Amino acid sequence: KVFGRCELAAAMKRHGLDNYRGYSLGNWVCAAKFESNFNTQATNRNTDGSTDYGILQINSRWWCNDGRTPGSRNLCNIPCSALLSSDITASVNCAKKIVSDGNGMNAWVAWRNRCKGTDVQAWIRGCRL
Numbered sequence: 109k110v111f112g113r114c115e116l117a118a119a120m121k122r123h124g125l126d127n128y129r130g131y132s133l134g135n136w137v138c139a140a141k142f143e144s145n146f147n148t149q150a151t152n153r154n155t156d157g158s159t160d161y162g163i164l165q166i167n168s169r170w171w172c173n174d175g176r177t178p179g180s181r182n183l184c185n186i187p188c189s190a191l192l193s194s195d196i197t198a199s200v201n202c203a204k205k206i207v208s209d210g211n212g213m214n215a216w217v218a219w220r221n222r223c224k225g226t227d228v229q230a231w232i233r234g235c236r237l
């Protein structure tokens with residue numbers, strides 16, 4: 109599924125991400141846009157052999173099982189294929205564990221380089237929320 113900007117903000121709000129660990133909704137929409145272009149089926153392979161999956165590009169080295177990342181963990185206790193669903197529930201539940209891990213949203217390279225310190229409220233402007 110390819111989400112619209114406001115469609116995705118509403119879905120994230122209903123799943124409890126607005127001000128989760130102090131990050132306003134616009135931070136989460138900004139991260140999704142530059143990680144996946146709002147596509148739940150996005151994958152990307154890394155140099156180390158791990159793969160990033162879904163709307164928030166969650167990595168198989170730590171967070172999910174894909175059957176081909178030797179010596180990796182599965183901290184969200186899910187197959188990586190669950191993160192490519194049209195239903196964002198698994199991705200949102202896993203993202204809550206990541207953002208709690210000590211580095212906040214700096215875990216997402218595109219958030220640190222393209223969203224942090226910007227007017228992120230722009231990402232939910234005009235939306236009925």
Ligand SMILES: [Cl-]
Pocket residue numbers: 113141
């Ligand atoms: Cl957009």
Ligand SMILES: [Cl-]
Pocket residue numbers: 132133134135228229232
């Ligand atoms: Cl915001």
Ligand SMILES: [Cl-]
Pocket residue numbers: 173174175176177178179180
């Ligand atoms: Cl594995």
Ligand SMILES: [Cl-]
Pocket residue numbers: 180181182183
């Ligand atoms: Cl594990």
Ligand SMILES: [Cl-]
Pocket residue numbers: 173182185186187
């Ligand atoms: Cl699993």
Ligand SMILES: [Cl-]
Pocket residue numbers: 119194195196197
């Ligand atoms: Cl959903």
Ligand SMILES: [Cl-]
Pocket residue numbers: 129211212213
């Ligand atoms: Cl933080």
Ligand code: NA
Pocket residue numbers: 168169170171172173174177180181182
């Ligand atoms: Na893994």
